[PDB]
Amino acid sequence: VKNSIIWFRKGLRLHDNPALLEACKDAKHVYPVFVLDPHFLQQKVSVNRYNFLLESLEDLQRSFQARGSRLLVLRGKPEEVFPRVFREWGVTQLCFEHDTEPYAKVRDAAVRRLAAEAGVEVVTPISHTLYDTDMLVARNGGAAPLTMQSFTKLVDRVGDPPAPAPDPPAAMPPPAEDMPSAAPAATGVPTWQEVGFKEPPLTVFKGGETEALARLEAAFQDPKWVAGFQKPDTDPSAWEKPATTVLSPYLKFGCLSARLFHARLLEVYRRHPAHSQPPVSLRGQLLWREFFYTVGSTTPNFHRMAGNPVCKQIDWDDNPEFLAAWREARTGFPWIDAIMTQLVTWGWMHHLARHSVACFLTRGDLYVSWERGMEVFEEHLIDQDHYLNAANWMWLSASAFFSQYFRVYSPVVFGKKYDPEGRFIRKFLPVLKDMPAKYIYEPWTAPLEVQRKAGCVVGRDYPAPIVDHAVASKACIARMAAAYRRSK
């Protein structure tokens, strides 16, 4: 008989899941498993993203119960849990979605060896990315493209991505009862207070495949907005109704299928001939994700500066004071401090909002390494993706892909062109709520008489700007110009 396990790591969804489909076929029992490490908070992880995963597990649990099944959240390390349940459950097949992250390769290669000794067939279809990334590299001549222009020419030569896999059956083969390691008391979906966190999450985006599909249909309700989407023209200050899809946390965890997203976009494009093209279109946004996955999975030390052959070696400053002020949203620039407050409360910011704080920390003002800023985003971003966070931090620091280090965003003017009244600043920095709009971006320029009436005296309620932007930017550009010469 066939008893199989569908191991969830990414791909927390039932739609477009070829690993689930293979696990249920001709199977008498199916064991849906997520492997949790209860000592994860003991070694980095804000409660905003960890609860987003827990909410995603509760969504899989309810979807499995409605099909006569149950989600099994096992505790411990994978290599120490699977050899036990392989024999206990009589497993003959193990299926999980292929991942290309560094820890994933060394982890899944060990689980494959443990399954081989147990006589367990391993099936690992590709469904997290649009394409087989190793196939794109093979078709390009054995090397990943380093420009988006060439990458777009490659995927259009390859053709369309595979269509989304059909939905699973209405009822699924259930796990065998009275199995000890599958007891409900030891295989439940925990909450955030149970895993060590002591402060509740404040993010407004709830996890789960159902929330992913609900936000998907929300974006596609205006088909002309989807067809004419241009990423650089979106508004970073819009928070009540974000100017972009806000599907990044659901794509990172696999709550939403990228191949379903791409398939729905083509349906619109076929009925809208003047639709936008890459790299500014919505489809182009998915190809940016596919671009960085293709390069990141083929570049050693892609998350570091040293040993990274694609990254430029720049003499960044070791400045804890500048990092601590930038990390704690006390820079003195309301536009920057507000985006860093949205980071720690929501775990998500608009793409150009991340441009402002990444440029300010790296090549624009403080000249701190992008690795330090990536570590901060890794803690708070609910969409933190190993290959996307690193690639865009290297982009913004002009260390890879992007080299126009003369383009420096102003922490004063960049937000003014979208939000002159500064409602984005007043929302996330309520201390500046009563400041007139003339000084909302430069409160230190307000007269003392006005600062006292707003309840916001600079230096007492809101800090003074840590640096003069005109002085700091002129120094960073010169240091980058020296580095870009030293780099030959």
CA distance to 50, 60, 108, 136, per residue, from 36 (Å): 11, 15, 15, 33
In angstroms, rounded to a whole number, what is the distance separating the alpha carbons of residues 191 and 345? Answer: 19
Concatenate the DSSP letters of all residues of 158-204 into one string: H-SPPPPPPPPPSS-PPPPTT-GGG-GGGS----SGGGT--S----S
Give the integer Cα–Cα distance in Å for 376 and 323: 10
42 is in an annotated binding site: no
- At closest approach, how far in Å is the CB of 413 from Cl ion? 5
The answer to whether 237 contacts Cl ion (rule: CB under 5 A) is no
Determine how many CB atoms are found less than 10 A away from the CB of residue 300: 10
**37 marked ligand binding residue:** no
State the DSSP H helix or E strand holding residue 122, giving kind and residue range, or none if neither: strand 121-123
Give the type of residue at 275: H
Partner whose binding site includes residue 337, from Cl ion, ligand FAD, none (CB under 5 to 8 Å by kind): none
Considering CB distances under 5 to 8 angstroms, the limit depending on partner class, which of ligand FAD, Cl ion, none binds residue 264? none
Residue 231 annotated as binding? yes
Alpha helices in 181-273 (DSSP H): 209-219, 223-227, 248-252, 258-271
Considering all CA atoms of the chain, what is the largest pairwise distance in Å, rounded to the nearest integer? 82
Q: With binding defined as CB under 5 A, does residue 410 bind Cl ion? A: yes
Q: Which does 231 bind (CB under 5 to 8 A by kind): Cl ion, ligand FAD, none?
A: ligand FAD
User: Which residue from 394, 395, 360, 353 is spatially nearest to 467, judged by alpha carbons?
Assistant: 360
Binding residue per annotation — 389?
Answer: yes
414 binds, among ligand FAD, Cl ion, none (CB under 5 to 8 A by kind): Cl ion
Closest by Cα among 168, 99, 160, 94 to 127:
99
Chain breaks in the chain (C to N over 2.5 A) after: 43
Q: Could you tell me which stretch among 38-46, 121-129, 302-310, 412-420 binds Cl ion (CB under 5 A)?
A: 412-420
Asked whether residue 246 is marked as a ligand-binding residue, the answer is yes
Nearer to ligand FAD, 15 or 350 (CB): 350
User: According to the binding rule CB under 5 A, does residue 405 interact with Cl ion?
Assistant: no
Long-range contacts of 153-160 (CB under 8 A, 24+ apart): 155/130, 155/131, 155/287, 155/290, 158/131, 160/262, 160/266
Residue number, 374 or 398, with CB nearest to Cl ion:
398
**Mutual orientation of helices 351-359 and 370-380 as an angle, nearest 10°?**
140
- Tell me which of 291, 414, 424, 428 binds Cl ion, using CB under 5 A: 414
What is the smallest separation between the CB atom of 373 and ligand FAD, expressed in angstroms?
A: 7
Indicate the residue among 175 and 254 with the shorter CB distance to ligand FAD: 254
Task: Give the span between the Cα atoms of 86 and 323, in whole angstroms.
Answer: 48
Identify what 389 binds: ligand FAD, Cl ion, none; CB under 5 to 8 Å per kind: ligand FAD
Token pair 């307000």 is found at 446
Question: Closest CB to ligand FAD among 253 and 439?
Answer: 253
The entry of ligand FAD, Cl ion, none near residue 388 (CB within 5 to 8 angstroms by kind) is: ligand FAD
Q: Is 424 in the site for Cl ion (CB under 5 A)?
A: no
Nearer CB in complex with ligand FAD: 252/264 = 252
| Residue placing its CB nearer to Cl ion in the complex, 285 or 410 | 410
Residue closer to ligand FAD (CB basis): 377 or 424: 377
Q: Which residues bind ligand FAD (CB under 6 A)?
A: 231, 244-248, 251-252, 285-286, 288-289, 292, 350-351, 354-355, 358, 377, 381, 383-385, 388-389, 392-393, 396
User: Helix count (H) and strand count (E) of the chain?
Assistant: 19, 5
**292 labelled ligand-binding:** yes
Contacting residues toward Cl ion, per CB under 5 A: 409-410, 413-414
Binding positions are: 231, 244-248, 285-292, 348, 351, 354, 383-385, 389, 392
